[PDB]
Amino acid sequence: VNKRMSMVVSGLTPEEFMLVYKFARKHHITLTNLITEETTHVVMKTDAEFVCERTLKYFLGIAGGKWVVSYFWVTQSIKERKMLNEHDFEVRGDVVNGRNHQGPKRARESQDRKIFRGLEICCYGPFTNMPTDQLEWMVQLCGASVVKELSSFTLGTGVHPIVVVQPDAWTEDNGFHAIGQMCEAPVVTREWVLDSVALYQCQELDTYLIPQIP
């Protein structure tokens, strides 16, 4: 009714996850395996310096502005058997985008100023290892307005259109270069979003832009 503490995990072996479950059980702690607004805390497997790989849950918890923390929180909490403070075991960074980019931290604070605010996005098919609808959710949670087809781009002039795709995901079709024809709006890779999100700050479209053909 007022406050709750649900959880998910990610990057965990089955094996490890059981000692999680155990703890959760112990401390009257909710735990789901599928993630939502309801989720508050998000546990990740890390290195000693709280650096982790980039799983889908990783990305989403940050976007949500959720408490992203290391498994070592638990192992320690277990060691003491005692509810240790989460804050300390917050994630500093990840493998790709720096071991201490403080992104999740930044997410938590920078809520008033959601990175993709003002932006219309058509997560244009196709993709892998995260379905569009998820990707779509991700950006909504970073302020983005979301579009379902190319035509449907609201036009003019405050609003910014942008197109995202996962090109390698295109079976026998180098067709992503034509999109420049389908609409004049920018075409960028997923990478942009992910990295934008990983740091919680909207990135330069340049690096991630995608050649087009007229």
């Binding site: 990610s10 990057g11 965990l12 790989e53 980039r54 799983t55 889908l56 849950k57 990305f59 790709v96 290892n129 995260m130 992910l194």
Partner: peptide, 9 residues
């Protein structure tokens, strides 16, 4: 299949 792993990026 007793599997299986979380995807990375």
């Amino acid at each position: 299949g007793e599997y299986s792993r979380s995807p990375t990026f």
